[model samples]
Target chain A: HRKPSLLAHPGPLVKSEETVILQCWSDVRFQHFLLHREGKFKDTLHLIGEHHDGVSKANFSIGPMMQDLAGTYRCYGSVTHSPYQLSAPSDPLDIVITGLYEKPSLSAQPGPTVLAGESVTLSCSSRSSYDMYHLSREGEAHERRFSAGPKVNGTFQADFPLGPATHGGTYRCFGSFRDSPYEWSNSSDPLLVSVTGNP
Target chain B: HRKPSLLAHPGPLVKSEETVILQCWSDVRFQHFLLHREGKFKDTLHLIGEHHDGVSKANFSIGPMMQDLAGTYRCYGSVTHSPYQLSAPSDPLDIVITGLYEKPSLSAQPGPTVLAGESVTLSCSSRSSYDMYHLSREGEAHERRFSAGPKVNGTFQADFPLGPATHGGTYRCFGSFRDSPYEWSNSSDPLLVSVTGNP
Candidate 1:
């Protein structure tokens, strides 16, 4: 059987002490679902899914978050007929913890809106002691990461080139230490990138 | 006693045929709350207020919106001891209806972001038969109105010149008719205006 789909409510990027709900659902009616957080055996949670509108779904609410709760997660479904057998695992969902440190700042080098084919660079800087920086666009999977360059004006910074303004959306950056990529500093104010040209 | 405060759920902007709830609250415990729609005599809705946390509140749900439901509204609170006497009215709340007509398009001429002292012009245009346009910034109390210029390329438009990037925020525009200023067409997609430099 196919794996159940897993999604996070509020969002995958959450503040340190906010509630986060994880939902697992499948079209094929399953009796139970299991949630597994990355690298922690004791963190697995199990629940019986309710069948509604031809779908079996369950919600797992976690938070008032602690640092240890930040990581990748997945879920599995199993039917009563096969009590010991588990279905395929769902795709991974990364929950990055924010508000751990002071937020970084995001700025576009050549303004926010740009003409098609124009080059634009987004700079992320912070006065904190972060050794790495990460940039993520809204509604996009995966994030861009960079090692922090030498401090300038007493602040660490990194630049993401974004070459040629082909698309436009909201972007935010985060600061983090080298030891933990899952944990992140507070997100910078969102920078909207707009592309103008042709319809 | 001071006037009660009125607020809308979801927001002041609503789509046609959607649920909208208006909340009126005050620190002084009141027996009843009255909702008044501007220029509509029989449209008043009265309900008893609920007291909680040292505040008296009432919710008036109006929905699956019809054309007449889009307008300004206010509320007043009255005590049981003097039912005939009414407290001061709450501030006006404008409920703009969206999805009524084809949405207009909003774009910034010089791009979405600008440096301080630079100028930007927001263009609101539509192919639909609208004779007037309005520009409103998010969180602002009032809207700017303009008469539509002559049609160009089969579309009517108006330009709002924002001199010197003194402030940055999200903005939207709407199309409307000259006869009925209260009724508006659907809103244009939001255009974010970001200002760079000098923090």
Candidate 2:
């Protein structure tokens, strides 16, 4: 076991329009750094960059955030010589996005109607923070939370890309709170996703 | 496609702990009724029996009402001789459960924690209602609603029987109003559904 710790900037409860930075600390200089969530949905983000004060950090200044970005996180390090030999993960960090954030706009890609074999991309964009985002379909059993894509035209956008919509229906998207990936902001208006197919 | 209208009484907006009767009617009598939802996660529920006034009706009176039962529903029918051939589904019926009743108690069957792959049933019993019930997990992405099971000593009990809990987590249950599924009589204490597995 190694002594590494994960730290959050502006505390775990981040507010609107503000940035959230997470730091991964290690006693010695490690070449590669990894950030991970240790439950239900497992996610690992590789940060290949410089370290600060013997720590590596991730910045959430791309776009505004919602509740869906909240959760536990940890970090690990690997030696520059032995990239495969990694250290133990850091203690869990509870990051939560408060509701004092801005709401983003949602829309559908390539129109709302599509052929049965075509794909549909749902997008949500916010102007301020860059933590993460989540998409919600009315009456859906899942949250569909995900990270934001690169900022375009001074706005950070997140995309929810789904299949060949064999079933025609309605869908709505929502932004995330840095607080919890399960939390969400006001939902977007319904997008009539129509699929033309015969049984 | 013939439009089949839906009727709910004691009205579409009924009080908590009340009985709701939904009927699908057409000028023509079509047997083998089916209930469907065109909303997200579209699903079809086949209802049987109760034929009156050339209209096909299904008695959802088996149990009291709960929150998970809230949603818009439509009906379909087919002639008995052509059992496999079903008619076009009905237009739509909006049934909502409100939170106007006293809170119910929630508990787990077969203890709180179980072996991995072992199914555990979560029981939510209303103080009085016998129509519908709602069960929610603390970190769950969706709500599980069920019709009230057989009455216990003249009251109602709903069982949320979940499969071989492949994962461990916390679950909460609540009683629902007949007006809208969003209404709830407060959530039961969290049930720690732990799943033990090898590392």
Top-scoring candidate (DockQ): 2
Candidate 1: pairs in clash: none
Candidate 2 local lDDT, B1-199, one digit each (tens): 3434455555444445676876555445566677775544466666664566544555444136655565677767776778677766554556655445576777776657654434578887865764677766764434567877656776688877775455777877667545445455655677788864421
Interface RMSDs of the predictions, in order, are 23.9, 14.7
DockQ of the candidate models in sequence: 0.01, 0.02
Write candidate 2's Cα lDDT for A7-36 as tens digits.
555455555566677766544577767877
Which candidate comes out best when scored by lDDT? 1
Give per-candidate clash totals: 0, 39
Candidate 1 ranges with C-alpha deviation above 4 Å:
A40-42, A138-143, A150-155, A167-169, A194-199, B1-199
| Candidate 1: Cα lDDT at A43 | 84
Chain A TM-score (model 2): 0.46
- The CA lDDT at A18 in model 1 is 87
Q: Give a tens-digit lDDT track for model 1, residues A16-74.
A: 77889888777777899999998532389899989877678779888688778888788
In model 2, which regions exceed 4 Å deviation? A1-199, B1-99, B177-182
Error of 2 at A73 (Å): 39
The C-alpha lDDT values of all candidates are 0.78, 0.60
